[PDB]
Structure formats: C-alpha cells, structure tokens
C-alpha cells in the first residue's frame, strides 16, 4: 500500500471524487452507479459511472457522520470522495492544487503507518513529498526553446517565463504535476549521478 | 592535488588521441607463447606502455635502481615503476 | 583489438598492392563493422560470439550493468584496521564503553 | 599450554594442573532470635578434602 | 602432575600397542591422581609395568 | 523387549505396544541400488512381494534398447545378461589411497548379420561401476558421497477445474503429462469449443483429430449422444472427412509441408505409437489404467499411449462436465469422477537413486549406440566385430560427470552419525529436473492432509528452502513403483487385527483409518462406542465402532528420525520443535560422552543402523582385545579381526574414533555392539552431557538468551572437543621447470627451518604456531628457454645454475596445535596422481579446543544461547548441601517462546538422577495405576525413556517428585513442586524465594568462536584490484557496505568517510605515507586521489570522450 501510494500510480480502489460543489443528484444503478451533482452557482453536472459492487459512503451533512448513507439531493464540498477507496492524486491536484494533495498524502501515509502502531514525525514525510511534487509540465512552448510536454522544475520555468515576459515575449503555459519516486529521481541536474 | 572545481566531458579529436598515446600498435600478437614476453610492438610491447618489471630496461643496460626519466637507447624504453604501465595508452592508426 | 588491428593491416596491404573498388569498399565496410563491435557488441546486428555462442564483453560493457564500473564504486570497498567477533552482553560497562 | 612455550623436545606432553585438595564446603546458621540479649547465631561449617 | 613423558610416543593423539585405551583416555584417568609435594622443585616419578 | 543382544537397560513409560519393530532405517537407500544392479536377494524380495515379472535395472535399460539395427535391415545387434564382478580393493584402502570403490561389469553381446546368418557372441568390458557400500554411500576419489532422493509429479492425466469470474461456469481442463512426447489439453469453454493443444498450438476442436483417425461420425454421434455441449460442437464443426481431417491436423502441426495422407498417417503413429519417440514409464501407464480402470487385468508391457485411452479420457471429461459423480466404460469397473490435486501423494512419486542412475546410463547407452550403429553401417561388413563397435567412453564419462557435477551428489555431512543418517534419509524437491526457487509456488511449501505417515511436517531447513526438503517417516517404505506407503492393521468387524498391510495414498483415501491412541481392550474390543477418525481430506468426526476399517500402528508414525528423539514433543510449539530438531543435527563429538538420562527409546536403534558402530556377525567368544584392533573367535573355529580407525579426520573437520567396550573372555552374541563411534556411549547416541541447570535471572549476565557456565566444566573437560585441520601442497611441473620440495630454502635463517626434516617436511609431533613454515619448496626463476635444445643442454651441462624463489606453505592466520600425521604421495612409487603433478603432500594439524566465551549451546527443545561469562566455581550458587550448579538459564524467555516442555524434562531428569521409591505398602496410589510394575523402584543415576506422544503425565511427575530418595546426608533438597533453597555465592545469604533446579541434556553447536574472531591491520594487498584480500584465512579486512556510507552521511561525518574510501582502501602512496607518519610522530597527511577514480578516468578516455578536470 505504501509502495503504491509513494509511486503515485492509479489507485486500485479509485474512489469517486467530488470535482465540484453542488446539489448531488445521484441515481442508483444496481449494476453501475451513476452520480451527478447540480452546481450551486451554476453550470453542468459532472457524471460518474462507477461500479455498484461497493457500499456507498457517508454524505457530507451538518452531522458529518460515517454511519449515514449517501443521500441524494444533499450537498458536498469540492474534492471530497463520494465512496470508500482512494482518490487519484492527479485529479485532486488539478482540481485543488498542490497543498491539498500534499496534506492528503501526508495524512494517508501517517494513517497507514499508525495502523501498525508505529509512530514517526510528519516532517520526515514532508521532506520527501516536497521533492516528489516539484515539477511543472508544460503544454505549449511558444516563445520557449524547450519541447512542449517536457518536465521543468518550477524555479527554472518561472525564471525563464519572467525573463521572456520582461522582454515582451509571450509566457509559456505550464502547470504543476507530481510523479513517482522513480521518475522524480531519473531526471536530475548532475550527469554523473544520472549515468550512475 | 585534490581540487576539482568542475568536470566537463568534451568530444575528442584525432589530434587529441595522437597527443594522449605514446605508441602505435602494429601487430595483434599477444605475449609470446614460448618465452612469455611481449612481441616487438605487439599488444604488450614495453616500447609502448612501459617495462614489465620496475626499474628494468628491456636490454638490461640500465637495470640499476638509480635511474629515473632515462630512456635506454639500446632498447628504447623508459625506467619507472611497474605502476606507470597502468596509466599509459596506445592509439591505433586507421587507413 | 586483434581483429581491428588485423583488418587495418589487411586494408593497408591491399591498398598498397592495388585492386578494384569493389574489394576495397567491402574491406572498408568490414573495418567499420569491427570498430562498431569493439566500441560496443550487440548494439546492432548479430553480436560476435566466439565461445559457446556467448556474447563477448565489449569496451562499453565496463560502464553499464551490475559490474559496470560506475555501480561498483558505490557498493563499497574492503578496508583495513577491521575485525569481527561474537557479541556477549556485559552489565559491568558504562554506556560509553565497550 | 604453560609447557608449550618452554620449547622442550618432542617427547614432552603438557597436562592441565589442578592444585586443590578441597572438594566440597557448606554452612548452615542456627539463629537464636529471642528478645533477650542472647541474640546470636551459631555457624556450622563442614569441609571435605581429597 | 604437570607434564608426562611416554616412551616411544611423540604426541598425545595416538595409541600404544598392548593397551586398551589410547593416550587421551589415560591422560584423563591420570588427571584424577592426587599427590602431595614436600619439595619446592619439579620432581620426577616412574611407572614401569609390563 | 531389547531386540539387540546387549543394549543398556532403561525401563520406559510404556503404555501401548507397537506390533512391529522399526524397519531398517537404511533399507530405503540400499533397496534402490540392489534393484538397479540385480541380486538374488532383491529377486527373492520381489517374488515375496508378489510381482510377476522380476526385472533388474541394468537388464531392463539395456534390453529395451536392443535389438539395434540399420535401416536397410541387413544388420542387427543384440546384447543382454549384464553381470558384475568382485571388488578392486577394500573400502579402507580405496578411501585412503585416493582410489574409487568400484567393480567391473560384463555384458554378453551377440553380433548377428541378417543376410549371412552368423552369430558372434562373447563377453565385453563396459567400464567400472561405483558400487554402493553397506552403509549406503559412494566413495569417489576418497571423498564420501551421498545422493538424495527427489520428488517428481508422476506422468499421467490430471483433471483441472477453473471457475470463470465472469461466466461463473465450471471449466474442466484435462492435461496429460507423459514422460516424453506431446501434451494434450481438452478444455470446455464458454464458447463450448472443446479443442486440443498439441505442443502449445491453437485450440483445434477435438472432433477434427477424432475424425483424423477415421473414427466414424456415427460412432461419434452415438457415443456422445448423452453429451449435449459436445454434440453441439459436433454439429458446429465444418471440415469433415478422414483425409481432410488428417491433412488439417498435419497443417496445424506442420504447416508449409506437402499435405498427403501418408504423411499424416505415419506422423500419427510416430508421435503416439512409436515407443522410442513417445514413451511413458510403467508407473505412468499403471496409474492411468487405475485412474480409468482400463486394462487392469493384465500386466502392462506396452508403454505407449492408445486411442481407447484418448476416447475414454474425453468421455470422462464430458461426463464430469455434466456433473456426474461416477462414470463407467465397457471393460472397466465403476470408478468415481472427481478432479485431481497436485499436492496429493497419490500423484507425486519418489525417484530413488535407481531411477537417476538408470536414466544416466540410458543417456550414455543412447550416445554409445548412435555411434555404434553409424560405425556398423559405415564399417566393413565382412570382418566387423562387436569389440570394435562398442565404445566405452560415453557411458563412463556420463556416470563420472553425474557423480561429480550433478547437484544430487552432495558430500555427506559427518558432524555426527545422526546428521549422516538424516542426510541419507533426506527428501529433496529442487535441483535438475525440478522446479526452481522463484517459479515454485508458495503453496507447495505448506502441509497437505496426505503428508501424515509419509513425510514429517516438523523437520525442515530454517533457510529459504522451507518445505522443499522433507524426510521419510519412521515406518515409511517406498513401493516398487515409487509411491510411499504406510503400515496399517485392518479392523474386520470392530476387532483389531495383529496382521498388518501397507497402503498407498489412493487406497488410504478410499478407506477408514482409526486412531492409534484410541483405547482398545486387551481382547481387541473397542471400549468406546465413538472413536475419532480421519476422513477423505481434512475431515475428522466420530463414527460407530463397527464401520471403522483401518487403524494406525504407533503414535510415532508421522515424526521424522531426528524429531523422534525429542522428549515431551507433545508440549512444545511447532516452530520450537522444528528449531530443536534442526539443532540436534549440529552437535560436535566430545571426548567423553555420556548417555542422556531422559530420552526416547529410538536412540540405540538409530545408532546401530547409523553404520558408525561395528557389530559382530556371528556369536563368538573374544580371545583378546586391543586399543587398535580386536580378534573374535567364531564358534566354527574361524578367527576374524576388525580394524578400528583412530583419530581420522571426518568429512567435516571433526574427529572420529572407536573404543571397544568388550572384555577378554566373553561369549559375545551376534548383533551385539563391539565398539562405540563418535557421539556414542554403550551402543546408543549421546550428543551431549548432563548439567545441573537453574532457572533465574542472575545480574543480567544471562540477559536476552545469554548463558553462564561454571568453571568446573572448563577445568574438567566436560565440554572439550577435538578439531583436526588439513593442509596440502603440491609441486607441479611448469614450462620453466619442475618444482621440488627441499629442506633448503633461499635466504632463511636456520631457526625458521629448524622443524623441517631432511626430506623437506616438518617432523611429526612438532608444535606449530600461526605464521610458521609447514613445508618448504623452491620455485625456479624465469629466463629464455628453448624446448628442443635447452633440454639436452641442461642434461649435459649447466645443471642447477638458475635462480629459485620461495613459495613454501605456511600455517594460515588463526591455526595452531600438534602435527599428528603426514601423508606424501610420490609418482616414483607408482601412486596415481592428477595429471601434471609429481609430489602432493598433505599435513594434518589437530587442536584440542576447550569450551570458552562466545560459544553456542542449546538443548533438545530449541533454546540457543551464548556463554555470557564463565564465573569461578567458588562464585556460582550452591544447593543447601554444598553442590554448586553448573549453568544458569534465564526465565523471561520460557513463557514467551512457549517451550514449557524443557521444564518437565528438567524435573524428570532430576527425579531420575536422584532416584525415587514410590510407596506401595498401603497399595499403589491412584496416580500410579498405569505406571509399569518395574518402574516403581529406581536407583541413583537411573535411566528413563519417554516415547513421543506416550510418556509420563503431569500426575506421574507430581507423584514421583514427592518420593525422591534422600541425599546421603539424610535430607531431601527439592520440594514437591520441584523448587529448592539456594545460597548466593557473592553475598553469601539465601535468596528470598526458592528456585527450580535439575539435570537437562545440553549439546554443543559447531559455531565456535575461534573461527569467527579475526583482526587485520596491515597485510597483503590484491594485485588486480589494489584492495586488501578478504576472508579470515587470507588475513583480509572486512567489507564496508553502502548502508555504512548512508549512515556516515546521516551523521554528517565527512573526513571519516574520506579516509574510509581513499586512505585505507585504494591510495597506495597514501597508505605508505600514513603508515610512516604513524610510525613516526608526524601528522597523517591528507589522502590523495583514489585509484578507482584514476582508473575510471583512464578508462573513459578510451571512448573518445575527452574528460577534462577543470581545476580552475
Ligand atoms: Zn635498455
């Protein structure tokens, strides 16, 4: 479980997530659960076609009780998991940002470790997750030399973006993204270690 | 001595390889199968890399210890410890 | 190295003797093949195998792989002034003592 | 091994030496814990030799 | 006893014809021997039985 | 009931009688070889067993081969009737002279020429055969060898069943695994395509091949009318026609070839009816016949697959798919229909040494006959002789390489007789022809309800090879096919039957097996109406006392040989019992052994069969005895002499001796032990001594499994052992000259060589210290040489005018002791030596080791430990009568490990040692009702034995502890509970509370401390890697793992890591300079550039990659 969590692959549970906050309008399909949520401010409904073999989790209510069943027509907060399992870090990252995914990973690892009874301080995990999620994928290069879709650390990407903008060149559109330990370590600055 | 500010990998060139080496191998013969000695300019000839023994000319002319930096004209080899054999290279010439 | 040197000497002798373009070009191709093999065996095409159809360890094999010289410098070295023995608990020692 | 380092000839064989004539010793105390000032103890030591 | 000397024998890991137990067993048996010394110097005894 | 004549008397807590003695513990190992070679005894045994056809191994293998012939049919050869001859030399000389115990075999070959009509028959030599000694071992080149059996899945038919996750429908798969040939897989799928996979091909419908044979479509319809899915498949297939079917089959098998009827017709019989190409073992054919109940009434002779087998198999598959319970075929009796299991002992056979040797000689015979047939075809037909045909090199080479490099040829560990017996009885599951560690599933390593009675579930290696190495049960015997059996007595009508029979797995499953421990009346009547029973698989339930059919023999029918001698095994834990069993195989022979006070009754029997103890053959009277040899006079007037090896190095470095325990003028009966080998005392195993133990934490010196020993053991040689080293040097010829051992050696002081004799070797009986010279030799120097001229020139002139180096052999780092003997082999004396050698000399050094700190000790219940400290005899606690204890054990480790059995063992040992006398004037106490009438009165230092699963109960111990005989002083030390009052040796005052004491058996492990301790400051450096050597023997430094680098980085320590990586491992000038600075008072100079970095540079510069430094 810890190996999978750190590697940041597709969760086996792959629980549904609350992409947007709204009025949940869920129709229970005995074969495949179909979940829709009416946005409060407005917009369309995000649709989830999940497997029905599981047992629905609690609905976010004033009580906030685990015994409660997933009641249709209620309201949920953005990013909350609708059913038991694990949320893909990429989805929560894109819909919440880096802070929420960082804290969620820290809490999950701490919980799994406390399950066995062992205790370790959080900072030892913060030092790791800080390095893990320090990459900024770029969709377009525009006025930049680097190939679009190439991983660039946030510091250098920001430096190049500000340099090009200061001279009038258009900025490069990039977004943060995380990776597993293997991919985060395979891309470094020193060539000798990489060859090692 | 032990000061290495940086390390850069450069792409060599024919003249560079000419500069590095101290010989030009010419025959594929290994150590002799009878006298257990290198063959003239073979793949181990002392005239290229260095003496098989330490402080020992091929011909014995300057086999004495008190000789360093002296190349023997009779055999055309240098007199230094066997370690120098470990840090000298040869370059083959291509037609 | 034997193969490369031998083929170079064959090239030199052949060009000295004189011959049409076909043989010289074929011979140059053979030389290029040998150099490619020496800098790396099995990179492209059938790797050379002398014994038991066993691929040979090229020059580039000194760096990659488990025995690659890069990795072996990190697995550790055998040091001096060492010693190993069994351990038995002793309650007559201070904490900073052995 | 004490004789090993003496460097004698081949025909010498060392043997362990045990200089002790005593074999077993034991003691028991006969106490008298009355409130009188005669509170003492009597030692009964037994020894056997080779 | 400190050290013994067996004629016709060069060390302890061997035997001697005519006996029922090897040198180690006789050494173990001799360990039980008890003697008292009056002189403060190495004295020598003999044991000849045929 | 002591079967052996003069075993020591030790009454036992016997409650039940075993109706049969333990069978020959080595009969299993010897029977395979006896069958293989072929002897009258084996033939008589086979006839007794009832087998109709007595067939040997060599005869079978070399008869199934003949008659060979050429394709033209004008020539043929036959050769049968293999017979053996006498021995070359006795076993002792073969082991000592470096020869190999073997014997020649002669085969009478008949050479027939068809067209002429002549016969040429005469004996032919076919090399030597490594005969098996009476102790079931192979002596190769003087080194002992022992081959371990193997577990293989019997070739046959296995009906697998996999449940679909989506369809949720049963898919019945049947797979046939013959010895050699094609594999057939018939699987019913959701699509219903019942097809075949011949040699991992596409699933082609079964009907296609069925018709390919010409099987009439009407017969398909009628024989499969009961089947519905297969009828649908029949109606679904498109291609129809015998020619079309066979051509399609051939194209699927071999596409791109001329499709003709003859090709497919011949290929069918070639792949399914040509015995040579397609063959199955007789075991496989018999098992398949039993499975299908077809061809049961005749003895199997043809070992090829048949069409009726295939049609019956497909009928069985379809019937199983229909869900039927049992199926019937014309000519076959009713049999059940069910899926098979891989982990059932009714399928996993056992191939003994006979099978392996037979296969190896079969390969050799195939290689020989190929060349023989080619030679006869090509050689002249007129004056050809079989002597010129047969080539002996391939078979001899095959057997030699099998004995040498085959993984199933392991050196017989000989720490003690028990270890050797266990190794001979081992059951391997890996190696050549078996599964690997990674591919083998984890489930196979678990127990199976069919293991009861065949393979012990306790004994197993602790390492990763867990579950792959078992051991035969006590009463297990291999059937002539290779299926393990187990004795049973059949209850006919609720009455036990004294007569016994042997049942295999399949027959055992089909019957009802009772419980041995179930009470049974003396007349054979079941007192209990309900008796527990074992059923088909994992099922146990009470049943009336009438339907029960079979009953076990003894409670000890599932334990191994090693596990069978662990008292109170019914109280320990599985892991602890396994640990103790494994520990028992690591004892070290002491100098003065003593038989255990408490131990099972399977000790003397396990020692007699071990082979390490001699025994008289005929009842005679001893005339005289000696420490080196014995002479017994037979009653027929024939004098016989036995020679006993004294102080001969064992196969594992320990010593082995024999001390006769007989007196002059005693009529010794046949079968009576005459001498005791290592770990023996009066013809019974004794791996340790008896020590007085105490259970209490003592000043933390026994903290966390540590142990404390009294100096009395050290000063009395109670646990003193003898270890014999072994060294050898050789002088082999070289192109530059030949080396010769010589007393003289260049530039050496007279004192150094003061021990060497004239011939150049150390005199016997001279003490040697580490670093001393053990044997001298001179190595010539290298100069220019010419093969043809230098030889003559040296012969005539210039003799002994060249330099010589010194390469004398010296004692390694950390060895000492006496020199007991020197063996020298010379080529002049016509002594066989390895090619290219002239003088090989070996020296034996024997050292006596006294138990010291850092030594392992452990009881029989698997409780290891180390000697924490050896206090003086005057400091140990002592009983109220002045008897100091000999060892103290910690108490916190007993309840956590849950090995309470050792406490009971200690109590019983104390009770037996002190002697007891149970009161009987008023009558036998209720708790003493079941005690044997002769066990109520014991003597001091008595001997008792508690068989496993049947021993003294808790009430028995409670009663016995209350009647121990008083000490000679008149007082009793221990109380009823077993505790006693002690007296501290330091304080001198008694402890506030009593402590438990008693005698517990203690062994000695082989993990001594002298081997482990080692130091290295400066010494030889490797020449190729420039690093210090490794290993204690080479006097090399320790390894420095990368985890250590990580730790050093963690602390932030930099200069230390720099030194460890540069100044003490690689840098030559660095080492020299730092050593000189330390020798003087100068500060250590900073390290330099490690050799590793410079080598990496000078190597990477070779790939045209200009690697600069940029010092700037
Ligand atoms: Zn010279």
From Swiss-Prot, chain A:
State the conditions that upregulate or repress this gene: 6-fold repressed by starvation.
Recorded superkingdom: Bacteria
Task of the protein = DNA-dependent RNA polymerase catalyzes the transcription of DNA into RNA using the four ribonucleoside triphosphates as substrates.
Q: Which family does it belong to?
A: Belongs to the RNA polymerase beta' chain family.
Assembly: The RNAP catalytic core consists of 2 alpha, 1 beta, 1 beta' and 1 omega subunit. When a sigma factor is associated with the core the holoenzyme is formed, which can initiate transcription.
- Return the protein name: DNA-directed RNA polymerase subunit beta'
The UniProt gene name for this protein comes to rpoC
Task: Tell which residues of the whole protein are contained here.
Answer: 1030 to 1225 of 1316
Curated annotation (Swiss-Prot), chain E:
Q: Kindly summarize what the UniProt induction comment says about this protein's expression.
A: 3-fold repressed by starvation.
**UniProt function note:** DNA-dependent RNA polymerase catalyzes the transcription of DNA into RNA using the four ribonucleoside triphosphates as substrates.
| Quaternary assembly | Homodimer. The RNAP catalytic core consists of 2 alpha, 1 beta, 1 beta' and 1 omega subunit. When a sigma factor is associated with the core the holoenzyme is formed, which can initiate transcription.
What protein family is recorded? Answer: Belongs to the RNA polymerase alpha chain family.
**What's noted about domains in the record?**
The N-terminal domain is essential for RNAP assembly and basal transcription, whereas the C-terminal domain is involved in interaction with transcriptional regulators and with upstream promoter elements.
According to UniProt, the name of this protein is DNA-directed RNA polymerase subunit alpha
The record lists the organism as Mycobacterium tuberculosis (strain ATCC 25618 / H37Rv)
Q: Which gene encodes it?
A: rpoA
UniProtKB/Swiss-Prot annotation, chain F:
**Mutation effect (residue 411 to V):** In strain: RJ37; rifampicin-resistant
Which keywords, in A-to-Z order, does the entry hold? Antibiotic resistance, DNA-directed RNA polymerase, Nucleotidyltransferase, Transcription, Transferase
Q: Does the keyword Cell membrane apply?
A: no
Catalysed reactions listed for this entry: RNA(n) + a ribonucleoside 5'-triphosphate = RNA(n+1) + diphosphate
Mutating residue 408 to P has which effect? In strain: vr2; rifampicin-resistant
* GO MF terms, alphabetically ordered: DNA binding; DNA-directed RNA polymerase activity; ribonucleoside binding
Effect annotated for changing residue 428 to L? In strain: vr11 and RJ37; rifampicin-resistant
Outcome of mutating residue 428 to Q, per the record?
In strain: vr9; rifampicin-resistant
* Highest rank taxon of the organism: Bacteria
Consequence of mutating residue 409 to T? Answer: In strain: vr3; rifampicin-resistant
Q: What is one cellular component GO term in this UniProt entry?
A: peptidoglycan-based cell wall
User: Could you tell me which Pfam families the record lists for this protein?
Assistant: RNA_pol_Rpb2_1, RNA_pol_Rpb2_2, RNA_pol_Rpb2_3, RNA_pol_Rpb2_45, RNA_pol_Rpb2_6, RNA_pol_Rpb2_7
The record gives the effect of mutating residue 423 to R as: In strain: vr7; rifampicin-resistant
Q: What is the effect of changing residue 423 to P?
A: In strain: vr8; rifampicin-resistant
Please give the annotated consequence of changing residue 423 to L: In strain: SP28; rifampicin-resistant
* Nucleotidyltransferase is among the record's keywords: yes
Q: What's the impact of mutating residue 120 to A?
A: Does not affect association with TRCF, but weakens interaction with CarD
> What is this enzyme's EC?
2.7.7.6
Q: What outcome is documented for mutating residue 423 to N in this protein?
A: In strain: vr6; rifampicin-resistant
Question: NCBIfam families, per this entry?
Answer: PRK00405.1, rpoB
Q: Which family does it belong to?
A: Belongs to the RNA polymerase beta chain family.
- Please give the subunit comment from the record: The RNAP catalytic core consists of 2 alpha, 1 beta, 1 beta' and 1 omega subunit. When a sigma factor is associated with the core the holoenzyme is formed, which can initiate transcription. Interacts with CarD, TRCF (Mfd) and RbpA.
This one is known as: DNA-directed RNA polymerase subunit beta
Q: Which organism is it from?
A: Mycobacterium tuberculosis (strain ATCC 25618 / H37Rv)
Which taxonomic lineage does the organism of this UniProt entry have?
A: Bacteria, Bacillati, Actinomycetota, Actinomycetes, Mycobacteriales
List the gene name: rpoB
């Amino acid at each position: 479980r810890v190996q999978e969590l750190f590697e940041a692959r597709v969760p086996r549970g792959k629980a549904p997530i609350a992409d947007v906050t709204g009025r949940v309008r869920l129709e229970d399909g005995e074969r495949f659960y179909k979940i829709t949520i009416v946005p409060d401010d407005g917009g369309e409904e995000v649709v989830y076609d999940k497997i029905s073999k599981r047992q629905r989790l609690r609905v976010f209510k004033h009580e906030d009780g685990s015994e409660r069943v997933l009641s249709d027509g209620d309201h949920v907060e953005v990013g909350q998991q609708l059913m038991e399992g694990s949320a893909d870090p990429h989805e929560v990252l894109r819909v919440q940002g880096p802070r929420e995914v960082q804290i969620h990973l820290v809490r999950e690892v701490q919980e799994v470790y406390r399950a066995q009874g062992v205790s370790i301080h959080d900072k030892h995990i913060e030092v790791i997750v800080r390095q893990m999620l320090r990459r900024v994928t770029i969709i377009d290069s525009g006025s930049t030399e680097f190939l679009p879709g190439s991983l660039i650390d946030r510091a250098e990407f920001e430096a190049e973006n500000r340099r090009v903008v200061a001279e009038g060149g258009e900025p490069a559109a990039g977004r943060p993204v995380l990776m597993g330990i293997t991919k985060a370590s395979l891309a470094t600055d020193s060539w000798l270690s990489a060859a090692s | 001595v032990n000061f290495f500010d940086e390390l850069r990998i450069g792409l060599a060139t024919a003249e560079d390889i000419r500069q590095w080496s101290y010989g030009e191998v010419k025959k594929p013969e290994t150590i002799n199968y009878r006298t257990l000695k290198p063959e003239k300019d073979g793949l181990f000839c002392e005239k290229i890399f260095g003496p098989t023994r330490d402080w020992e000319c091929y011909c014995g002319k300057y086999k004495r210890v008190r000789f360093k930096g002296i190349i023997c004209e009779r055999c055309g080899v240098e007199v230094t410890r066997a370690k120098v054999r470990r840090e000298r290279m040869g370059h083959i010439e291509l037609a | 190295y034997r193969r490369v040197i031998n083929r170079n000497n064959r090239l030199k002798r052949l060009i000295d003797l004189g011959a049409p373009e076909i043989i010289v070009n074929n011979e140059k191709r053979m030389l290029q093949e040998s150099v490619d093999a020496l800098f790396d065996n099995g990179r492209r095409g059938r790797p050379v195998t002398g014994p038991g159809n066993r691929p040979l360890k090229s020059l580039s094999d000194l760096l990659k792989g488990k025995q690659g010289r890069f990795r072996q410098n990190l697995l550790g070295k055998r040091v001096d002034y060492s010693g190993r023995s069994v351990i038995v608990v002793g309650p007559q020692l201070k904490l900073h003592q052995c | 091994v004490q004789n090993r380092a003496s460097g004698a000839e081949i025909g010498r064989i060392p043997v362990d030496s045990i200089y002790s004539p005593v074999l077993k010793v034991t003691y028991k105390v006969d106490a008298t814990r009355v409130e009188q000032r005669t509170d003492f103890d009597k030692l009964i030591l037994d020894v056997e030799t080779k | 006893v400190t050290s013994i000397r067996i004629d016709g024998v060069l060390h302890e890991f061997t035997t001697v014809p005519g006996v029922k137990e090897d040198v180690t067993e006789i050494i173990l048996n001799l360990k039980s021997l008890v003697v008292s010394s009056e002189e403060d110097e190495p004295v020598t005894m003999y044991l000849r039985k045929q | 009931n002591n079967s052996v004549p003069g075993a020591p008397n030790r009454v036992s807590f016997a409650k039940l009688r075993e109706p049969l003695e333990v069978p020959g513990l080595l009969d299993v190992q010897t029977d395979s070889f006896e069958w293989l070679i072929g002897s009258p005894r084996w033939r008589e045994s086979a006839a007794e067993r009832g087998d109709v056809n007595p067939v040997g191994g060599l005869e079978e293998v070399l008869y199934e081969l003949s008659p060979i012939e050429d394709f033209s049919g004008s020539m043929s050869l036959s050769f049968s009737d293999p017979r053996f001859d006498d021995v070359k030399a006795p076993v002792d000389e073969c082991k000592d002279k470096d020869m190999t115990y073997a014997a020649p075999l002669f085969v009478t070959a008949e050479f027939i020429n068809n067209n002429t009509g002549e016969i040429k028959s005469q004996t032919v030599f076919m090399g030597d055969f490594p005969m098996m000694t009476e102790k079931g071992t192979f002596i190769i080149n003087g080194t002992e060898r022992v081959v371990v059996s193997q577990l293989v899945r019997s070739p046959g038919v296995y009906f697998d069943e996999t449940i679909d996750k989506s369809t949720d429908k049963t898919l019945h798969s049947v797979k046939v695994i013959p010895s050699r040939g094609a594999w057939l897989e018939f699987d019913v799928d959701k699509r219903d395509t019942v097809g075949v996979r011949i040699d991992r091909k596409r699933r082609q419908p079964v009907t296609v091949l069925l018709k390919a044979l010409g099987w009439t479509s009407e017969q398909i319809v009628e024989r499969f009318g009961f089947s519905e899915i297969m009828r649908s498949t029949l109606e679904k297939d498109n291609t129809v026609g015998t020619d079309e079917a066979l051509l399609d089959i051939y194209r699927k098998l071999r596409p791109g070839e001329p499709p003709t009827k003859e090709s497919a017709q011949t290929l069918l019989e070639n792949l399914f009816f040509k015995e040579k190409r397609y063959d199955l073992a007789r075991v496989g054919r018999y098992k398949v016949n039993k499975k299908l109940g077809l061809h049961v009434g005749e003895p199997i002779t043809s070992s090829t697959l048949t069409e009726e087998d295939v049609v019956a198999t497909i009928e069985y598959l379809v019937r199983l798919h229909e869900g039927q319970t049992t199926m019937t075929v014309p000519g076959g009796v009713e049999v059940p229909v069910e899926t098979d299991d891989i982990d059932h002992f009714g399928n996993r056979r056992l191939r003994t040494v006979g099978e392996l040797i037979q296969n190896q000689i079969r390969v050799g015979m195939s290689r020989m006959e190929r060349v023989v047939r080619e030679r006869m075809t090509t050689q002249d037909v007129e004056a050809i002789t079989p002597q010129t045909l047969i080539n002996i090199r391939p078979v001899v080479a095959a057997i030699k390489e099998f004995f040498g490099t085959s993984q199933l040829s392991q050196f017989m560990d000989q720490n003690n007789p028990l270890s050797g017996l266990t190794h001979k009885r081992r059951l391997s599951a890996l190696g050549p022809g078996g599964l690997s560690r990674e591919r083998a599933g984890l489930e196979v390593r678990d127990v199976h309800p069919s293991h009861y009675g065949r393979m012990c579930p306790i004994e197993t290696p602790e390492g990763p090879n867990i579950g792959l190495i078992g051991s035969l049960s006590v009463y297990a015997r291999v059937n002539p096919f290779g299926f393990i059996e187990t004795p049973y007595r059949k209850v006919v009508d609720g009455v036990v039957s004294d007569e016994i029979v042997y049942l295999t797995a399949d027959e055992e499953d089909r019957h009802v097996v009772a419980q041995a421990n179930s009470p049974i009346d003396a007349d054979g009547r079941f007192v209990e109406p309900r008796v527990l029973v074992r059923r088909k698989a994992g099922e146990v339930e009470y049943v009336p006392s009438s339907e029960v059919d079979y009953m076990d023999v003894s409670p000890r029918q599932m334990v191994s040989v090693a596990t069978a001698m662990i008292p109170f095994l019914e109280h320990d834990d599985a892991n602890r019992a396994l640990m103790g069993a494994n520990m028992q195989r690591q004892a070290v022979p002491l100098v003065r052994s003593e038989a255990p006070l408490v131990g099972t009754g399977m000790e003397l029997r396990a020692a007699i069969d071990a082979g390490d103890v001699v025994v008289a053959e005929e009842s005679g009277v001893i005339e005289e005895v000696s420490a080196d040899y014995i002479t017994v006079m037979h009653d027929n007037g024939t004098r016989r002499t036995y020679r006993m090896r004294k102080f001969a190095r064992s196969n594992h470095g320990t010593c082995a001796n024999q001390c006769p325990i007989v007196d002059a003028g005693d009529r010794v009966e046949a079968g009576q032990v005459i001498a005791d080998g290592p770990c023996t005392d009066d013809g019974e195993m004794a791996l340790g001594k008896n020590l007085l133990v105490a259970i209490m934490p003592w000043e933390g010196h026994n903290y966390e499994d540590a142990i404390i020993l009294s100096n009395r053991l050290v000063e009395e040689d109670v646990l003193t052992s003898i270890h014999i080293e072994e060294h050898e040097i050789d002088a082999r010829d070289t192109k530059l000259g030949a080396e010769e051992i010589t007393r003289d050696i260049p530039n050496i002081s007279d004192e150094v060589l003061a021990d060497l004799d004239e011939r150049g070797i150390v005199r016997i009986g001279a003490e040697v210290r580490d670093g001393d010279i053990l044997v001298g030799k001179v190595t010539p120097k290298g100069e220019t040489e010419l093969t043809p001229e230098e030889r003559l020139l040296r012969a005539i002139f210039g003799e002994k005018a060249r330099e010589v180096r010194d390469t004398s052999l010296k004692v390694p780092h950390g060895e000492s002791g006496k020199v007991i003997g020197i063996r020298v082999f010379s080529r002049e004396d016509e002594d066989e030596l390895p090619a290219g050698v002239n003088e090989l000399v070996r020296v034996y050094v024997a050292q006596k080791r006294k138990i010291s700190d850092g030594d392992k000790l452990a009881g029989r219940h698997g409780n290891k430990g180390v000697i924490g400290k050896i206090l003086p005899v005057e400091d140990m606690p002592f009983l109220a009568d002045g008897t100091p204890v000999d060892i103290i054990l910690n108490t916190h480790g007993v309840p956590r490990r849950m090995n309470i059995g050792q406490i009971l063992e200690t109590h019983l040992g104390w009770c037996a040692h002190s002697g007891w006398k149970v009161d009987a004037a008023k009558g036998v106490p209720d708790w003493a009702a079941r005690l044997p009438d002769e066990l109520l009165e014991a003597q001091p230092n008595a001997i008792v034995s508690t068989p496993v699963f049947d021993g003294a109960q808790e009430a028995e111990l409670q009663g016995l502890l209350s009647c121990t005989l008083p000490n000679r002083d008149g007082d009793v030390l221990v109380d009823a509970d077993g505790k006693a009052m002690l007296f501290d040796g330091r304080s001198g005052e008694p402890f506030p509370y009593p402590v438990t004491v008693g005698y517990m058996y203690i062994m000695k492990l082989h993990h001594l401390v002298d081997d482990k301790i080692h130091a290295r400051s400066t010494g030889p450096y490797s020449m190729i890697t420039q690093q210090p050597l490794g290993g204690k023997a080479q006097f090399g430094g320790q390894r420095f793992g990368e985890m250590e680098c990580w730790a050093m980085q963690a602390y932030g320590a930099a200069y230390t890591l720099q030194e460890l990586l540069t100044i003490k491992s690689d840098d030559t000038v660095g080492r020299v300079k730092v050593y000189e600075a330390i020798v003087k008072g100068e500060n250590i100079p900073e390290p330099g550039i490690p050799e590793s970095f410079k080598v990496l540079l000078k190597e990477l510069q070779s790939l045209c990659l200009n690697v600069e430094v940029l010092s700037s």
